[PDB]
């Protein structure tokens, strides 16, 4: 039998899509991830509501006031401000319907107005196997739909970013956010080993191609969420076929920050292209 | 005369049905009547809001948006229903009134 390197055609199998769930790894790894709650599985009443079509509001069904309480209960437990999720995704696509135009939730309506007008939450609820080899989606195994309510903070998008592993080992990384960040490249080298060292408490997690969200503040490098090691999470600034050419092997990452001087900048750049004269 | 509005009252007109040609043969779902207590996705130019349908009467309807809009009386509107777990155009309309976030 040949035997294939590591570089070979990326697929996507059930399991992998298992793994990937908030209860799945968020088990493993809660000592890495900022407070949540999750409430497996998620109240009936709220699937069946999800699944009715347009929006109607309280202020047609409605979930039945066990669920509002029980959603709101772990609310208050959250310091009175949530962001949601079902198992994968959040309603970042239907940020339009908020108020404030954030992913915050105060109230219980806030989050279902959220969940129920957004196409990534809809992909959870519908699409979640549609790429599997390993499953066939006629109608998918001993699997439940989970409410997660993260304890929302003020998460600054500059210091979140996506992380590329390929066989346990830290393939690139880049900026989650679009815009410019000057600060970036002055901390870049702390950034990585921050992020290099947390892959080294995800030795745990099942598979060995994953995609692992981070916020870094402070000297802290916290655990967002695991997404699967396929093109369905966004490459950001890599491209899937980019990420399948990167050697495994290599012990640097590849680093991607969205792009935009001195007499010693000047010098002290003219003192590397000194050294690019001898090695 | 471009002002912020937190409430809007359209005159408007719907879809007999859903956009489209079913790849069966099958006709597009028929487009139904615009509910109280429904919120919809409005697209007041480049502004995409829900809007919360407070009251109807005939070709006039009264949209409480989710957050404050910048627009004009007479603006051209596009109403959206979630159908399918899709935002399906539903409808067209024009600010006739509204009210201000604070003047
Ligand atoms: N607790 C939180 N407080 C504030 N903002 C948050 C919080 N958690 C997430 N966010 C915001 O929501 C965005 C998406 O969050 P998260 O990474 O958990 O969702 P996701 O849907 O699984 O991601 P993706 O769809 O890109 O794979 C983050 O980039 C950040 O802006
Ligand atoms: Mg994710």
């Known amino acids: 039998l040949v035997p294939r390197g590591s570089h070979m055609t990326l697929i996507l199998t059930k399991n992998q899509v298992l793994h990937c769930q908030f209860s799945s790894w968020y088990s493993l790894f809660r000592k890495l991830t900022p407070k949540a709650k999750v409430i497996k599985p998620i109240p009936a009443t709220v699937l069946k509501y999800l699944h009715e079509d347009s929006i109607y509001v309280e202020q047609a069904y409605y979930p039945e006031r066990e669920a509002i309480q029980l959603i709101e209960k772990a609310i208050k437990e959250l310091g009175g401000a949530v962001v949601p999720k079902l198992n994968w995704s959040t309603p970042k696509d239907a940020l339009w319907i908020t108020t404030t135009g954030s992913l915050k939730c105060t109230t219980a309506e806030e989050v279902l107005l959220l969940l129920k007008s957004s196409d990534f939450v809809a992909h959870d609820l519908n699409h979640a196997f549609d790429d599997c080899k390993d499953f066939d989606n006629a109608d998918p195994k001993d699997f439940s739909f989970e409410l997660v309510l993260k304890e929302w903070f003020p998460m600054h998008a500059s210091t979140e970013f996506r992380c590329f592993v390929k066989s346990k080992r830290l393939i690139a990384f880049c900026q989650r956010d679009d815009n410019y960040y000057e600060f970036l490249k002055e901390n870049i080298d702390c950034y990585e080993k921050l992020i290099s060292d947390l892959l080294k408490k995800l030795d745990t997690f099942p598979d060995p191609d994953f995609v692992f969200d981070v916020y870094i503040h402070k000297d802290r490098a916290w655990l967002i969420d695991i997404n699967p090691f396929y093109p369905r999470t966004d490459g950001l600034l890599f491209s899937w076929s980019e990420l399948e050419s990167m050697n495994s092997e290599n012990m640097k990452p590849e680093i991607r920050l969205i792009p935009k001087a001195s007499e010693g900048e000047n010098l002290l750049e003219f003192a590397q292209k000194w050294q690019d004269l001898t090695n | ?103």
Not at chain 2, 50 to 55: D, F, H, I, K, S
Not at chain 2, 59 to 70: G, I
């Open chain 2, 1 to 103: 005369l471009p002002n912020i509005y937190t409430d809007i009252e359209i005159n408007y007109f719907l879809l007999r049905r859903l956009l489209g040609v079913k790849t069966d043969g099958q006709k597009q779902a028929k487009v139904r009547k615009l509910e109280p207590n429904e919120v919809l996705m409005v697209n007041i130019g480049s502004t995409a809001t829900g809007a919360r349908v407070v009251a109807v009467k005939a070709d006039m309807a009264r949209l409480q948006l989710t957050s404050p809009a910048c627009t004009e009386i007479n603006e051209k509107i596009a109403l959206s229903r979630r159908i399918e777990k899709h935002w399906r155009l539903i409808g067209w309309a024009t600010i006739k009134k509204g009210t201000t976030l604070e003047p």
